[PDB]
Amino acid sequence: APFGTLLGYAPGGVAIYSSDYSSLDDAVFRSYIDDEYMGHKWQAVEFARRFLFLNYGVVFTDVGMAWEIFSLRFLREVVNDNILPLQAFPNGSPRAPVAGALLIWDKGGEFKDTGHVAIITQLHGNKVRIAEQNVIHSPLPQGQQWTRELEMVVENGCYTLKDTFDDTTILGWMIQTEDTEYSLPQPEIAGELLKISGARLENKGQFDGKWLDEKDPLQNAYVQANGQVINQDPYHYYTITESAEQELIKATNELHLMYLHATDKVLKDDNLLALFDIPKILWPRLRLSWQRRRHHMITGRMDFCMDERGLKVYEYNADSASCHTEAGLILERWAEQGYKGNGFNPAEGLINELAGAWKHSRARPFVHIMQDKDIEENYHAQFMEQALHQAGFETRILRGLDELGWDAAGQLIDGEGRLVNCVWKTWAWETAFDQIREVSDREFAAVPIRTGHPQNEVRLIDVLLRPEVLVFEPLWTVIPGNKAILPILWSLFPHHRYLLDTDFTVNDELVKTGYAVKPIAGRCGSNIDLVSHHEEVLDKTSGKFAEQKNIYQQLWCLPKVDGKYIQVCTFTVGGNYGGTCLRGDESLVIKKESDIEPLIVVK
Amino acid sequence: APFGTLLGYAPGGVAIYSSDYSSDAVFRSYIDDEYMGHKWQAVEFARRFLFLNYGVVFTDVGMAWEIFSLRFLREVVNDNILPLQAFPNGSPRAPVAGALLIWDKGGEFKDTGHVAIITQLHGNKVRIAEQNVIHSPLPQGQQWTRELEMVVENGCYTLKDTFDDTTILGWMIQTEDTEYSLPQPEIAGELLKISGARLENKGQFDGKWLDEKDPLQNAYVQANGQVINQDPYHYYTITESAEQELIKATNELHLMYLHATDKVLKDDNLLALFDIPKILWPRLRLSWQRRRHHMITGRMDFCMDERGLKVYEYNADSASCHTEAGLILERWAEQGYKGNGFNPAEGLINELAGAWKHSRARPFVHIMQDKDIEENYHAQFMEQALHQAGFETRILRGLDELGWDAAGQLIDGEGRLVNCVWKTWAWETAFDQIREVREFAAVPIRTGHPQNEVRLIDVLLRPEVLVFEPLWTVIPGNKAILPILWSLFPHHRYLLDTDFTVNDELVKTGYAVKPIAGRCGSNIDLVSHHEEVLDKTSGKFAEQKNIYQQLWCLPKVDGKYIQVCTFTVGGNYGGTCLRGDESLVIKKESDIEPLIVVK
């Protein structure tokens, strides 16, 4: 049957289409049910997820290949962002494969690389019936709600299934419950596959002069701020196994959910929100932003620590994040100029990933881009405008605020006399939050913004907080961006493998392990204080946030490879993994002036 | 400045438009799916300000002065209810900024009254931001319309308006602090009495007073001939005071009811009390979330009299008697009424059309009714509203005309895909078809069948089909919610103590036993405080769970027991009607009584 042909339904009346493409017949491939993404039309995963959502209102995180599903340990309940537990069971197990359970196949034979995922509709005395997409492309029998039957075998309490193929491996089934009995543990990876490795290029004088094309305005923009220099030794680059990246993608999609699951919890209790030191006048605004703009986050960066010790996360820059051009364009150019290998730059598709985000965002036709007057932010801004243009939107880059002004009534318009109602800022939300605390001793009934002024002096706050102006990133991003959320994440996912015990007061265990003091609203590594268990200040950086609240996070020093400390950074575009990049530095603390270290994933 | 001209903004960037009409749906002001008011009255700005700045809103009200009588506020993002206090102009409680300032109708603010927002409080005056008082631009960047003179004498704060014939009721603050505040006003039971009357038997109803060549009117006749009740020359009346009361009571209980629904769907232990097949629960939740604002109409059962105003149930699901108060009674009054009074359910047809316009319903709506000449006009009365709303309709009587195609897609007796459906059928009926059956992995509906034999669930629970009323409505329409409303709003003036067991209290006051998912007064058991069964009705729900509601027998005016019913159209009062009965139990076979409101 043709691609998209309704072949029939599964229990509850869930459609099953023919995913049969054909070299004889890009965003339209996204399957959505309202604002919730189901998958890719019409893979096995898309159906599996849509089945669970339409029938149980739950969904499993984003996954590259279907076989990967078997490694997940939880599902998300949509209507409340609540996380439920998911258990795994091997083929041939005491825990019986009940109807509604997930059945996963491992890449192999009939499912060479992708693997497979299906749903069990009904169990029997010696056979189970299942529903699945992308494996059968012919219209099912009228009324039959299952695509294939599988010979089950019950022996002394052990349920085993035999597929209808002779070259496929049925991993097992998955059930949503707290009863861990008979289940398999959460797969931890071999630390050795997580270590960072350094390497060098054959110095054929590849980066001796103008290797960065200055014809390209974007690259020339980069130079204007950094010249023809990415990092000290441009002939040296690090690498990570494909196994390691997979891990990163995994830990990125998972921590994203966790972060939102906690963001949603904080906005549901004034006792927690009260900890982020955010102007009480904005609380209602935060909650509204969280509710109506739940899926509007464009991108964010996650700081990690990776090596033999395992993978841990330092912070999640969900509000403002740079380094997009670096791992995005410069490195591509770097590789294109000097890397003659088989590896690949993990951020070689960030621009495209962004355009996709913007297309599916509800941003308006014309988007004013707000940046500071730092020539250092010119390329970051132009890098995004490019993505925006690729998405089709129209833009105009605003440098500073001198161009803004109000009409007679009080409407926010730009220099050319146009109305500003949708902006993408490079400005941190915290900066706007400060223009509020300046006049904190006044009793204002609402956020103190100007809708008019003699000198026509517009302020950052007089824009981002102007009700009818749509902003990216959404206001709620400030919550998962504030480090005050770490203690809560630990409180919610205690002892999680990617987490570090964090608290507002140097508790007891932090003491015996050492810890890092970090301002909740900081960044660029400012005012960071590392204290080991021997109560010795391993390092201390200055900064302006020296007067904010702090949080204490169990120490977990960055690894040192080839004379530098290497931190790993993954990107999140629209909630899913978007790429990776390294940030090396002489000190344990990555600061603003750290360098970008070329990275190549090898197989 | 002409209509809808931006004059300026209030603190927080809340626009203020010129509501100069001198220069029909287009007038509704929204912010997303949430209603803000009528463009561009005072109430509109006041509400939009509270929603934009604090994420809260206040219930629908006829006039602005009516705000002062409210005692709650709804926080959108969580459908949670917040307490609101009212203070008189001259109260020790200073009028802080962000508070509502209500003007009682009078002088400059004749019949409407008025409401504004206190932006900044000084020491000798205050500044406010209103909307329907001016109509000219505001000074460049001025975030306030007027400054009012505040006088402070011995702990008390007073305010003088700029007009000499206006009356300032006071301000309102959302606080738990109840000091200095005004207790919620109550109405003298004497105005709540239901009076009886009679028309001049000039012989106006002795023959064919029903047009009959009006598909609707005729439809009605095919089921009941030319009769509405026993004596067409007798009617009842209620004061405008009582109607406004009935309206206030409706709007409030509606919110109260959804607050309980939102709660029920957030706690498994609670939802478990309704006996709704677990398999559906996820659907229920999903429905509440996505269909929150898609309810079209519901009906409330009230006991009104000197004693006060109590509500028995809220038929949020399968309504009824719409045509009655809606049309027939209009043909009644038109035909035989002379007085100045009016029918409280006249513009019901328009209220529904309005609700339908703003519903997200698909373009072609299939109307599903059972095969009873009785439900015909109810279905055809609704169809007319849809048509006035611009939607296309096709009435399906029974499930025979339906069928599937090769793939398994639902279609009507003309091969058209059925995707939008307004049902008269009760959701509980569908639920039963699920109880009839295996450890099914989902709602057991059919997508194919040898005889092409479709069932009710095979339609209502089919994903791509958009049903009205949405699934979540079965919660507020299930009597199990009563015990919860009591737990949430203890001794609320409109609620009656209800429990799933005859607690001590009920025993002393007497009670009514009623099946949680029943209707039409089926299996109703009324026991007195003497412990004597006052009345009993048999029924088809005898076996399901019950709840006990403290007895509170309907009044008896002119030989019959009069019960009052209010309609809800889009979560707001849509009209009123009566239902008399020889007995204390209103049933499916009870008559409708012409109701007239007089001032």
Ligand SMILES: NCCCCNCCCNC(=O)CNC(=O)[C@H](CS)NC(=O)CC[C@H](N)C(=O)O
């Ligand atoms: N001849 C022109 C006279 C113009 C008088 N303008 C005085 C304005 C005064 N204060 C107001 O307009 C507020 N008016 C109101 O109270 C009115 C009545 S339709 N009600 C509505 O806005 C309905 C709101 C709606 N019921 C809701 O619930 O939000």
Ligand SMILES: Nc1ncnc2c1ncn2[C@@H]1O[C@H](COP(=O)(O)OP(=O)(O)O)[C@@H](O)[C@H]1O
């Ligand atoms: N718990 C920790 N253990 C060891 N080093 C840490 C820890 N937390 C932070 N650091 C170091 O400090 C730097 C700054 O902390 P980070 O969490 O990224 O905040 P930001 O960059 O926003 O200031 C990191 O890049 C890392 O090198």
Ligand SMILES: Nc1ncnc2c1ncn2[C@@H]1O[C@H](COP(=O)(O)OP(=O)(O)O)[C@@H](O)[C@H]1O
């Ligand atoms: N607490 C009560 N005290 C006295 N009569 C009651 C009480 N509750 C219900 N009734 C009577 O029983 C009838 C049926 O109850 P109701 O709550 O409307 O359920 P339904 O009409 O759906 O069966 C009402 O119309 C009313 O006359």
Ligand SMILES: [Mg+2]
């Ligand atoms: Mg960092």
Ligand SMILES: [Mg+2]
């Ligand atoms: Mg940071």
Ligand SMILES: [Mg+2]
């Ligand atoms: Mg009822």
Ligand SMILES: [Mg+2]
């Ligand atoms: Mg009733």
